[PDB]
Amino acid sequence: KTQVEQSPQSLVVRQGENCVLQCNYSVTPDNHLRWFKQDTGKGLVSLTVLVDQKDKTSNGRYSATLDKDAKHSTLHITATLLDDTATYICVVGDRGSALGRLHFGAGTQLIVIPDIQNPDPAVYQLRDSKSSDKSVCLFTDFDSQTNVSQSKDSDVYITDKCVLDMRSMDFKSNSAVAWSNFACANAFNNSIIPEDTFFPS
Amino acid sequence: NYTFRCLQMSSFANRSWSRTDSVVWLGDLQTHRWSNDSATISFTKPWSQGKLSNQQWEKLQHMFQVYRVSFTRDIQELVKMMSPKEDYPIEIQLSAGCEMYPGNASESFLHVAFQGKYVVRFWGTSWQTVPGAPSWLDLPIKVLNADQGTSATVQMLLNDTCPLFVRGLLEAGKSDLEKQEKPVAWLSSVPSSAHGHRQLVCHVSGFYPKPVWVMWMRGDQEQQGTHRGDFLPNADETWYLQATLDVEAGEEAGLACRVKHSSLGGQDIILYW
Amino acid sequence: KTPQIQVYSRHPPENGKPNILNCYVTQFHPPHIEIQMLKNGKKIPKVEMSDMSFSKDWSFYILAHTEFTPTETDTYACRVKHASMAEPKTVYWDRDM
Amino acid sequence: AAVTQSPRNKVAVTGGKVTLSCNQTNNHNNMYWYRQDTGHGLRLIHYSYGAGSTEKGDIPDGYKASRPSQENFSLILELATPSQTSVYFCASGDEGYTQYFGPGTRLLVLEDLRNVTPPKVSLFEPSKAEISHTQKATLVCLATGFYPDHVELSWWVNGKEVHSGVCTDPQPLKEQPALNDSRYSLSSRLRVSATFWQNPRNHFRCQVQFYGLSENDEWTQDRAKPVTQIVSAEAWGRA
Ligand SMILES: CCCCCCCCCCCCCCCCCCCCCCCCCC(=O)N[C@@H](CO[C@H]1O[C@H](CO)[C@H](OCc2ccc(Cl)c(Cl)c2)[C@H](O)[C@H]1O)[C@H](O)[C@H](O)CCCCCCCCCCCCCC
Ligand SMILES: *[C@@H]1O[C@H](CO[C@@H]2O[C@@H](C)[C@@H](O)[C@@H](O)[C@@H]2O)[C@@H](O[C@@H]2O[C@H](CO)[C@@H](O)[C@H](O)[C@H]2NC(C)=O)[C@H](O)[C@H]1NC(C)=O
Ligand SMILES: *[C@@H]1O[C@H](CO)[C@@H](O[C@@H]2O[C@H](CO)[C@@H](O)[C@H](O)[C@H]2NC(C)=O)[C@H](O)[C@H]1NC(C)=O
Ligand SMILES: *[C@@H]1O[C@H](CO)[C@@H](O)[C@H](O)[C@H]1NC(C)=O
Ligand code: NA
Ligand code: NA
Ligand code: NA
Ligand code: NA
Ligand code: NA
Ligand code: NA
Ligand code: NA
Ligand code: NA
Ligand code: NA
């Protein structure tokens, strides 16, 4: 269909694991090949550019190879981190000048599952800044083994899980939010939550 | 000394239509043709591959195949870039090759003409304009010179590949390059511009190689009025030449045409009117 | 530049003897050109063309040739249409020239 | 070599005129417009080799390019269609092969603007139970009742944007998933140390930039014209 094909389409890895991304192309001639990282809803960050017939480059935890005879490139990510969650895009430029056209791959989506060392699963009630009556339920500090299901009740809203990173403390935590107009004891009944989940009162 | 010339002629009629055709000469003998409608370069001699292996030739041809397509798009883009300064139709000619000297010495060249005027060469490690070229070419030159990959490839082609290839051609093609073909001559006459004047013509055809001597003579007296025409090609890679002499009607008798050529081995042709 | 046309036989012409007639067209540009070889003002079929090339001065040239048998009566010519000329130019073969 | 795009986000109606602008002060001759659609690589729409030059790319249909100056290259959608919903990237460069990309512009073309509605925003203050259990304090921001889903949620402490300890839902959820033009909700979390939350000199604000109608868009309904706007909620730390 296209002159630049990437594989895999998508993959999920756990933090600390390495992975390899593939780019195969039919573009002729092949002046250079660039790998971009694109974070969700953000722009293109150049990781490396490969120019030689048989090239190897590195950029911190990123390393790449190019074999122009096989028309094949690989991007290796060593010791993946949460922030590696992104789309990785292969681009082939067909000239060594502005007369070139760029040929873009459709990208590989990488998800990195964070390693939660010290889980402390709990469901907390938070009250609205203005109106005392309004509240939300916060399910937090569960490990990535736990999965959050959508609500059975159509007038109860539950978000997907979401990991934040408190960088100065080197601390990450999962959370999901539930609200309705309903108690926090009942909020996440439709999900399989840890037995030792803390419910305060 | 032999000059190897790769001659490319490219016509761009408008934004969409173009054709590129090439011919290759070793001295005055054609060794290759590459028509626009052919994917591959054609040999026009048994020895046109020189001493290159099949793998070496296929690799070299591949480079040229990529070049032809890339060249076509690059011109089209350069026209867009300089718009509306330069418009179609556009003719581009390239003359590239090497001159071979004794003691395995050589000089390579790559000259480019735009609308029939020599404007650009490759020299050393880069493209440059030559004296008399218009200033607008400075932007194309800047863009072409940004392409390090083309520069490196051209340097190798001119410095290394050309002389190596041609050395092998001279070896493989020796018997053709050193061929001797004998001239045949014949005489004729027509009225000249002047009133009562005749113009005698000595026709000489089928000789190779090019160097030849043709003189009208009355005995041992070389007639200084002898005028050699241009060298004209025959279809069989031999040459044709005629030498004229403007004389007075009645004075034809006594005149003769003498032809000296390397192929005759000292036995000159002498034709008496 | 306006095309020069030279017409000449490969071999000494002799009436009734097969020969080759050459038409050499030079010093023209642009390279688009139509070349016809004529017998008695009529287009000769299966005329062979050399590959077009160009000289030191970048002007184009090409050689047309055809088998022919000269006679007392038959005329031979080379007719050239080129954008540099309002009308086609015709040069007749003259064995004496 | 930097490149900027405006607007960064736009909601338009079918048949309306949309202009996407790109500015670069690199004195680059060459500029390029691409669109990025899921399942595809970036595709070239139009490009330009200088002021007055515009050239068709691979997918020019439905777009006009304009290069009034060296600095500015515009993409004009004369009669916007839903098929032009995309993320648009502009790039520039000199004679070298490198193209320097802008940050992208998100365009949504709706069939009709009748359902466009800005968010309500509420800030939920940390649980005393969390503070005692973890010595941490999670604030939750909730944007509700908005349409379409073109919002940017950000956190601000003492008038400066914070990223550390933040996570925002990857996409809004539908409030009425049965309905065609369902309104959306979006949540975000900001987690800080208990002592940071307990400091009454700390002013916390959740901001939602909503992309809606422009000044020039027609509005026939009785309710407030749902223009592009910021909606926010705030709270002070306390012991
Ligand atoms: C000449 C000696 C020949 C001896 C041997 C052959 C003899 C056998 C017979 C041959 C018959 C063929 C006859 C052909 C006619 C003669 C033609 C002579 C001209 C030769 C020019 C060859 C140029 C080859 C290169 C080329 O195709 N460029 C192409 C493709 O280039 C791309 O792919 C290349 C793949 O190799 C590299 O990428 C890979 C790469 C990346 C990094 C590195 Cl380090 C390296 Cl090494 C390689 C490049 O970097 C990449 O940009 C490029 O588009 C060129 O611009 C093509 C045009 C060059 C000629 C320009 C002439 C000047 C025109 C001026 C016009 C002004 C008019 C303005 C309106
Ligand atoms: C190739 O040779 C050139 C010099 O040779 C001249 O240019 C060639 C293209 C060809 O036309 C020859 O017949 C000419 O005599 C080298 O150019 C020099 O390169 C060095 C740096 O590499 C530079 O300091 C000199 O100024 C260059 N010379 C000139 C006259 O400009 C070139 O390096 C050779 N390349 C390779 C890869 O061998
Ligand atoms: C000269 O050769 C080129 C290369 O084959 C021709 O370009 C092709 O034209 C056909 C249509 O006729 C297209 O389908 C191809 O995509 C073109 N090839 C490339 C590489 O772009 C060109 O048409 C020929 N010129 C003439 C006048 O016949
Ligand atoms: C381009 O030129 C060719 C050759 O002269 C001609 O046949 C054709 O009509 C032209 N094409 C266009 C689109 O004008
Ligand atoms: Na992998
Ligand atoms: Na890089
Ligand atoms: Na380059
Ligand atoms: Na281009
Ligand atoms: Na692609
Ligand atoms: Na609580
Ligand atoms: Na290059
Ligand atoms: Na307009
Ligand atoms: Na550029």
CSV table of C-alpha atoms in Angstrom, one decimal, chain D residues 3-217:
chain,number,residue,atom,x,y,z
D,3,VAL,CA,8.4,27.3,13.8
D,4,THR,CA,5.0,28.3,15.2
D,5,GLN,CA,1.4,27.6,14.2
D,6,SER,CA,-1.9,29.4,14.9
D,7,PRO,CA,-4.4,28.5,15.9
D,8,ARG,CA,-3.3,25.4,17.9
D,9,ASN,CA,-6.9,24.1,18.0
D,10,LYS,CA,-10.0,25.0,16.0
D,11,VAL,CA,-13.6,23.9,15.9
D,12,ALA,CA,-15.3,24.8,12.6
D,13,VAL,CA,-18.6,24.2,10.7
D,14,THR,CA,-19.0,22.6,7.3
D,15,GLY,CA,-19.0,25.2,4.5
D,16,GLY,CA,-17.1,27.8,6.7
D,17,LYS,CA,-13.7,29.3,5.9
D,18,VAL,CA,-10.7,28.2,7.9
D,19,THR,CA,-7.1,29.6,7.7
D,20,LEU,CA,-4.2,27.7,9.4
D,21,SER,CA,-1.1,29.9,9.8
D,22,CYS,CA,2.6,29.0,10.1
D,23,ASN,CA,5.3,31.5,11.0
D,24,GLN,CA,9.1,31.0,11.0
D,25,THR,CA,11.9,33.6,11.6
D,26,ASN,CA,14.7,31.3,10.4
D,27,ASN,CA,14.8,33.1,7.0
D,28,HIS,CA,14.1,29.7,5.5
D,29,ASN,CA,13.0,29.8,1.8
D,30,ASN,CA,11.1,26.5,2.0
D,31,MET,CA,7.9,25.7,3.9
D,32,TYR,CA,5.6,22.7,3.9
D,33,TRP,CA,2.1,21.8,5.0
D,34,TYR,CA,1.2,18.2,6.1
D,35,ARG,CA,-1.8,16.5,7.7
D,36,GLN,CA,-1.6,13.5,10.0
D,37,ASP,CA,-4.5,11.0,10.2
D,38,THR,CA,-4.7,7.8,12.2
D,39,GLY,CA,-3.5,4.8,10.2
D,40,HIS,CA,-1.5,7.1,7.9
D,41,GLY,CA,1.9,8.7,7.9
D,42,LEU,CA,2.1,12.5,7.5
D,43,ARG,CA,1.0,13.5,4.0
D,44,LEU,CA,2.1,16.6,2.1
D,45,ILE,CA,-0.7,19.0,1.1
D,46,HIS,CA,1.1,22.1,-0.3
D,47,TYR,CA,4.6,23.5,-0.1
D,48,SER,CA,6.4,26.7,-1.1
D,49,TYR,CA,9.9,27.7,-2.3
D,50,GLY,CA,9.4,31.4,-1.4
D,51,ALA,CA,7.1,34.4,-1.2
D,52,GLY,CA,4.6,34.1,-4.0
D,53,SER,CA,5.4,30.4,-4.6
D,54,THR,CA,2.8,27.8,-3.9
D,55,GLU,CA,3.1,24.2,-5.2
D,56,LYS,CA,0.7,21.3,-4.9
D,57,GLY,CA,1.8,18.3,-2.8
D,58,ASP,CA,0.4,14.8,-2.8
D,59,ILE,CA,-3.1,15.6,-1.4
D,60,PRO,CA,-3.8,19.3,-2.4
D,61,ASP,CA,-7.6,18.9,-3.1
D,62,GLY,CA,-9.8,21.1,-0.9
D,63,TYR,CA,-6.9,23.3,0.2
D,64,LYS,CA,-5.4,26.5,-1.1
D,65,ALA,CA,-1.9,27.6,0.0
D,66,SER,CA,-0.7,31.2,0.4
D,67,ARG,CA,2.9,32.5,0.9
D,68,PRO,CA,2.5,36.3,1.4
D,69,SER,CA,6.0,36.6,2.9
D,70,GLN,CA,9.2,34.6,3.6
D,71,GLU,CA,8.0,34.4,7.3
D,72,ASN,CA,4.3,33.2,6.8
D,73,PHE,CA,2.8,30.2,5.0
D,74,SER,CA,-1.0,29.8,5.2
D,75,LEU,CA,-3.3,26.8,4.5
D,76,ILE,CA,-6.8,28.0,3.5
D,77,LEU,CA,-9.9,25.7,3.6
D,78,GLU,CA,-12.3,27.8,1.6
D,79,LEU,CA,-15.3,25.4,2.2
D,80,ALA,CA,-14.4,23.2,5.2
D,81,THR,CA,-15.7,19.6,5.2
D,82,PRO,CA,-15.6,16.9,7.9
D,83,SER,CA,-13.0,15.0,5.9
D,84,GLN,CA,-10.6,17.9,6.8
D,85,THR,CA,-10.8,17.0,10.5
D,86,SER,CA,-7.1,16.3,11.2
D,87,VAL,CA,-3.9,17.4,12.8
D,88,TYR,CA,-2.0,19.8,10.6
D,89,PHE,CA,1.8,20.2,10.7
D,90,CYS,CA,3.8,23.0,9.0
D,91,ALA,CA,7.6,22.7,8.5
D,92,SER,CA,10.4,24.9,7.2
D,93,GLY,CA,13.9,24.4,6.0
D,94,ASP,CA,16.8,25.9,3.9
D,95,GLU,CA,18.6,24.1,1.0
D,96,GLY,CA,19.5,21.2,3.4
D,97,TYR,CA,17.2,18.2,3.7
D,98,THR,CA,16.1,18.9,7.3
D,99,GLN,CA,12.5,20.0,7.7
D,100,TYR,CA,11.9,21.7,11.1
D,101,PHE,CA,8.3,20.9,12.2
D,102,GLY,CA,5.8,23.1,14.1
D,103,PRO,CA,3.9,21.8,17.1
D,104,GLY,CA,0.7,20.9,15.1
D,105,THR,CA,-2.8,22.3,14.8
D,106,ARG,CA,-5.9,20.2,15.7
D,107,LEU,CA,-9.0,20.9,13.5
D,108,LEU,CA,-12.5,19.5,13.9
D,109,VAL,CA,-15.1,20.3,11.3
D,110,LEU,CA,-18.6,19.7,12.6
D,111,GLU,CA,-21.7,19.3,10.4
D,112,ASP,CA,-23.5,21.8,12.7
D,113,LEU,CA,-22.6,23.9,15.8
D,114,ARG,CA,-26.0,23.6,17.6
D,115,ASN,CA,-24.7,21.3,20.4
D,116,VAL,CA,-21.5,23.3,21.2
D,117,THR,CA,-21.3,23.9,25.0
D,118,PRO,CA,-18.5,25.0,27.3
D,119,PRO,CA,-17.5,23.0,30.4
D,120,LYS,CA,-18.5,23.4,34.0
D,121,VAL,CA,-15.3,23.0,36.1
D,122,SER,CA,-15.2,21.8,39.7
D,123,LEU,CA,-12.1,21.3,42.0
D,124,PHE,CA,-12.3,18.6,44.6
D,125,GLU,CA,-10.1,19.1,47.7
D,126,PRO,CA,-7.9,16.3,49.2
D,127,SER,CA,-9.3,13.7,51.6
D,128,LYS,CA,-8.2,14.1,55.3
D,129,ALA,CA,-8.1,10.3,55.2
D,130,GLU,CA,-5.5,10.2,52.4
D,131,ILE,CA,-3.3,12.8,54.1
D,132,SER,CA,-3.2,10.8,57.3
D,133,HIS,CA,-2.8,7.4,55.5
D,134,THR,CA,-0.1,8.4,52.9
D,135,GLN,CA,1.2,11.9,53.8
D,136,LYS,CA,0.1,12.8,50.3
D,137,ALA,CA,-2.8,15.0,49.0
D,138,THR,CA,-4.6,14.4,45.7
D,139,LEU,CA,-6.7,17.2,44.2
D,140,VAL,CA,-9.2,16.2,41.5
D,141,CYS,CA,-10.5,18.5,38.7
D,142,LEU,CA,-13.7,17.7,36.9
D,143,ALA,CA,-14.8,19.3,33.6
D,144,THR,CA,-18.4,18.3,32.7
D,145,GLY,CA,-21.2,19.0,30.2
D,146,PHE,CA,-19.0,20.2,27.3
D,147,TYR,CA,-19.2,19.6,23.5
D,148,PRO,CA,-17.2,18.9,21.4
D,149,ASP,CA,-14.2,17.2,23.1
D,150,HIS,CA,-11.6,19.9,22.2
D,151,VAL,CA,-10.4,21.0,25.6
D,152,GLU,CA,-6.9,21.4,27.2
D,153,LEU,CA,-6.8,20.9,31.0
D,154,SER,CA,-3.8,22.3,32.9
D,155,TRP,CA,-2.9,22.8,36.6
D,156,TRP,CA,-1.5,26.1,38.1
D,157,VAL,CA,0.1,26.6,41.5
D,158,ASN,CA,0.7,30.3,42.4
D,159,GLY,CA,0.2,31.3,38.8
D,160,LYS,CA,2.8,28.9,37.3
D,161,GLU,CA,1.8,25.7,35.4
D,162,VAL,CA,2.7,22.4,37.1
D,163,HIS,CA,3.3,19.0,35.3
D,164,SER,CA,4.8,16.9,38.1
D,165,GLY,CA,2.3,14.7,39.9
D,166,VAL,CA,-0.4,15.4,37.3
D,167,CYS,CA,-2.3,12.9,35.2
D,168,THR,CA,-5.3,13.7,33.0
D,169,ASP,CA,-7.7,11.2,31.4
D,170,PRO,CA,-6.4,10.3,27.9
D,171,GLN,CA,-9.8,11.1,26.4
D,172,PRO,CA,-13.1,12.5,27.7
D,173,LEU,CA,-16.0,10.2,28.5
D,174,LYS,CA,-19.6,10.5,27.2
D,175,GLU,CA,-22.2,11.6,29.7
D,176,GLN,CA,-25.1,10.1,27.5
D,177,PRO,CA,-23.4,7.4,25.4
D,178,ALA,CA,-26.8,6.5,23.9
D,179,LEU,CA,-27.2,10.0,22.4
D,180,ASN,CA,-25.6,11.1,19.1
D,181,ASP,CA,-24.0,14.4,20.3
D,182,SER,CA,-23.4,13.4,23.9
D,183,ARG,CA,-21.8,16.0,26.1
D,184,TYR,CA,-18.4,15.0,27.6
D,185,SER,CA,-16.7,14.8,31.0
D,186,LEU,CA,-12.9,14.9,31.7
D,187,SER,CA,-11.1,14.4,35.0
D,188,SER,CA,-7.6,15.2,36.1
D,189,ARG,CA,-5.5,14.6,39.3
D,190,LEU,CA,-2.8,16.6,40.9
D,191,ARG,CA,-1.0,14.9,43.8
D,192,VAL,CA,1.3,16.9,46.1
D,193,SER,CA,2.8,16.3,49.6
D,194,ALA,CA,0.5,16.9,52.6
D,195,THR,CA,2.8,19.8,53.7
D,196,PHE,CA,2.5,21.4,50.3
D,197,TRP,CA,-1.4,21.2,50.4
D,198,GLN,CA,-1.3,22.3,54.1
D,199,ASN,CA,0.5,25.5,53.2
D,200,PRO,CA,-2.1,28.4,53.0
D,201,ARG,CA,0.3,30.5,50.8
D,202,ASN,CA,-0.3,27.9,48.0
D,203,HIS,CA,-3.1,28.8,45.5
D,204,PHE,CA,-4.2,25.8,43.3
D,205,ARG,CA,-6.1,26.3,40.1
D,206,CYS,CA,-7.4,23.8,37.5
D,207,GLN,CA,-7.9,25.5,34.1
D,208,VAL,CA,-9.8,24.1,31.1
D,209,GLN,CA,-9.3,25.9,27.8
D,210,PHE,CA,-12.4,25.2,25.7
D,211,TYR,CA,-12.4,25.5,21.9
D,212,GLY,CA,-15.8,26.6,20.5
D,213,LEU,CA,-17.2,29.3,18.4
D,214,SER,CA,-15.4,32.4,17.2
D,215,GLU,CA,-16.8,36.0,17.4
D,216,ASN,CA,-17.8,35.8,13.7
D,217,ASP,CA,-19.8,32.5,14.0
